[PDB]
Each structure stands twice: as C-alpha cells, then as structure tokens.
Amino acid sequence: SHMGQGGSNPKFENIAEGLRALLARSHVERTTDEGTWVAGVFVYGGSKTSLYNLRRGTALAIPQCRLTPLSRLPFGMAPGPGPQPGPLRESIVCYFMVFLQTHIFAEVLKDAIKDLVMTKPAPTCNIRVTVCSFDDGVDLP
Amino acid sequence: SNPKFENIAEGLRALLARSHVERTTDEGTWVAGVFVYGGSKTSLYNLRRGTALAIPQCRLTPLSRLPFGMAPGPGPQPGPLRESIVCYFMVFLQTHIFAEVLKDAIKDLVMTKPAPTCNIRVTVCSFDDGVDLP
Numbered sequence: 477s478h479m480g481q482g483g484s485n486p487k488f489e490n491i492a493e494g495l496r497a498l499l500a501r502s503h504v505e506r507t508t509d510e511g512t513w514v515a516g517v518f519v520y521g522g523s524k525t526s527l528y529n530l531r532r533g534t535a536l537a538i539p540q541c542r543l544t545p546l547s548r549l550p551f552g553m554a555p556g557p558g559p560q561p562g563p564l565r566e567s568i569v570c571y572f573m574v575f576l577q578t579h580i581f582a583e584v585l586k587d588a589i590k591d592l593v594m595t596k597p598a599p600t601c602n603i604r605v606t607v608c609s610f611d612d613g614v615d616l617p
Numbered sequence: 618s619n620p621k622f623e624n625i626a627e628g629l630r631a632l633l634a635r636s637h638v639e640r641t642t643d644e645g646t647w648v649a650g651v652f653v654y655g656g657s658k659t660s661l662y663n664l665r666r667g668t669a670l671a672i673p674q675c676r677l678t679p680l681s682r683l684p685f686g687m688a689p690g691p692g693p694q695p696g697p698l699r700e701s702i703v704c705y706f707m708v709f710l711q712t713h714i715f716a717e718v719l720k721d722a723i724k725d726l727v728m729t730k731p732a733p734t735c736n737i738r739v740t741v742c743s744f745d746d747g748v749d750l751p
C-alpha cells in the first residue's frame with residue numbers, strides 16, 4: 477500500500493483506505509435510476525477533529541455520497557444555559573450527515589464506520605452513527 | 618421583544634392547534650424529525666427561531682449548508698464535500714406522529730408568504746437507532 481514521506485499517511489487517508497476495505501465486502505446498490513437522496517448516515521460525537529478526519533476520509537472513499545459540513549448538536553433533556561430558547565442552544569458535540577441514494581448502502585456505511593472507529597483510540601472510538609431515512613427525499617441542488 | 622420570531626411562532630401554533638398528538642415519550646429518545654431546507658438563509662433562520670418558541674419539546678440544529686446533488690450531462694459530478702448556497706436545519710423529535718404534523722404545519726405556513734419563504738421545503742426524517750443528544 478502507498479506510504480507518505482517519512483513512513484506515514486494523514487489520518488483522513490488512512491480512514492479512506494479502511495472504509496474502502498470494509499466496503500469492498502458488500503456489493504450492494506449505491507445508486508438508483510431516479511437518483512433521489514432518500515437515505516443517510518448521521519455521524520456525531522467523538523471530537524471535532526476526529527469527525528473532521530472521518531468526514532474527509534468518507535468523501536475520499538465514496539464518490540456516490542454527498543456530505544454536509546461539520547456542525548453542532550443541540551442538547552437533549554435539560555439544556556445548558558443561554559439567552560436563546562432551550563431548543564436552540566448548542567452543545568459542544570459535533571455532527572455531520574451523509575446523503576445516499578439507497579437504504580441498503582446507508583446500512584453498509586453505518587456498519588463500516590462503526591467497525592472502523594472501534595479500531596481507533598479515544599476520542600475517535602466514541603463516534604456514534606445511525607442510519608436515517610427521508611420520507612420525501614432531499615432535493616439537493 | 619422579537620415580533621418576527623413571535624409572529625412565526627403564533628402562525629405555527631395556530632396550525633399545530635388542530636392536532637393533539639403526543640410530542641414526547643416516556644423513553645425520551647430522539648427518533649424522528651423534520652429536515653427543513655431551501656428558501657433563503659434568513660428565511661430559514663426566522664423559521665428556526667419561530668419553531669423553537671412554538672415547540673419547546675423539539676431540539677434544533679444550527680443552520681448549515683447542503684451539498685450538491687447530481688449534475689446533468691456526462692460529467693463531472695460534484696465532489697462529496699462541495700457546499701451549495703442552499704441551507705438547512707434539522708428538528709429532532711421524540712415521536713414520528715408529531716413529525717408528520719409538524720411537516721404539514723410548516724408546509725401550510727410557508728405557502729402563505731411570497732418568495733423566498735414559500736420556497737422552503739420540508740421532509741419528515743427518521744433515525745433508525747435514535748440520536749443520543751448530549
């Protein structure tokens with residue numbers, strides 16, 4: 477496998493290679509004729525830097541997907557203090573979303589991310605992922 | 618002190634008044650939501666502020682940006698990270714049944730206004746395993 481100068485690669489490149497290896501196990505549909513964005517993977521936690529690396533590596537590994545920027549999650553029960561109404565207050569936990577054209581590929585990618593981060597030290601192993609579904613799709617521009 | 622956000626909240630409340638479905642569960646888990654996008658950045662912001670006031674039981678992301686979809690023609694397709702000028706936010710909810718009601722209310726609310734407000738789009742979404750908001 478390719479090795480960068482001095483015997484190392486950037487974290488996002490190694491993520492891409494790990495994802496490629498896991499995804500090669502699954503020959504599931506990634507696109508449809510209609511090309512609608514009906515499924516997704518919602519990825520959060522860890523730390524901002526770990527999600528940054530994961531997001532960059534996901535894009536490198538999967539041309540068939542589309543990604544949001546990194547953003548932040550609100551709180552669950554009992555939000556922290558702030559001048560805005562509770563529903564708007566931002567935690568320090570970050571997230572990003574992956575949009576996909578098939579529900580099965582979302583499942584495969586969710587499982588790949590879970591398997592990959594379990595091999596990394598904290599905080600990367602604390603990244604969480606769930607598949608999501610969009611009833612009417614998302615009409616990406 | 619914020620008449621614009623309060624007016625949006627009042628309009629949403631009037632539409633939501635027609636339903637009495639449960640907005641919370643004993644489990645308390647964030648399993649459904651609405652994904653709101655388009656319009657303009659400012660119109661989405663204003664809706665987000667009004668939603669927070671009308672629905673204390675929801676949680677909201679900040680505004681963010683959508684990537685591009687498919688490009689017509691033989692290529693090139695956009696890279697997965699490319700960002701468009703179209704914004705979105707997510708509403709997290711404890712029940713799918715109320716997600717459906719909120720989707721209908723947002724659609725009915727924004728169609729009463731001129732562009733760009735009326736170009737706001739909304740779809741129900743679901744999270745297979747929930748989202749463990751902190």
Ligand SMILES: O=C(O)c1cccc(C#Cc2ccccc2)c1-n1cccc1
Pocket residue numbers: 624625627628629659660661663664726727729730733734
């Ligand atoms: O600021 C925006 O663009 C905007 C975004 C979303 C919703 C509204 C509204 C409304 C509404 C409020 C009361 C009754 C009927 C409709 C909105 N808005 C408010 C004034 C002009 C536009």
